[PDB]
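Budget justification aside, the reviewers requested a transparent look at the raw inputs and outputs of the sequence design task funded under Objective 1. We therefore reproduce one unedited record. The lines immediately below are the structure tokens for a 138-residue chain.
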């Protein structure tokens, strides 16, 4: 439910990256706008010499990059938006390099990280609808 909210955010962001067909919530559309901006820059600043052949590789890649994104233990909405930006980067490299034909599997370990590492802060700072949306909405 709390997890299930973040899973929907992650699933929505995935469906937008893959350009897949109601409609996301305002919260989700606001997140997708800011996340895709960050994604464009992060993919720029980095990834080639690593082949994402498996969803277990993208999960392993995700933990490696995000444990470094939060090393100092400081968190803010900008860092949390970078989580979704990196999920989009891994989907793209997965779609290309998967030695295989998984939407659900990626949404899950993105939500697991957010829930298990930022859930308390997100709540204490307004949640998605009273903290993130209020800060990033037009």
């Amino acid at each position: 439910s709390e997890f299930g909210y973040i899973y929907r955010l992650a699933q929505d962001y995935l469906q937008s990256v893959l350009q897949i067909p109601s409609g996301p919530s305002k919260t989700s559309r606001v997140l997708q706008n800011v996340a895709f901006s960050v994604q464009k820059e992060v993919e720029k600043n980095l990834l080639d010499n690593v082949n994402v052949v498996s969803v277990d590789t993208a999960r392993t890649l995700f933990n490696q990059v995000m444990e470094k994104e939060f090393e100092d233990g400081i968190i803010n909405w900008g860092r949390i938006v970078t989580i979704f930006a990196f999920e989009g980067i891994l989907i793209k490299k997965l779609l290309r390099q998967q030695i295989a034909p998984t939407y659900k599997e990626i949404s899950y370990f993105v939500a697991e990280f957010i829930m298990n590492n930022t859930g308390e802060w997100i709540r204490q700072n307004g949640g998605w609808e009273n903290g993130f949306v209020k800060k990033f909405e037009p």
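The radius of gyration is 14 Å. The chain is about 75% helix and 0% strand. Computational costs for records of this kind are itemized in the attached budget.
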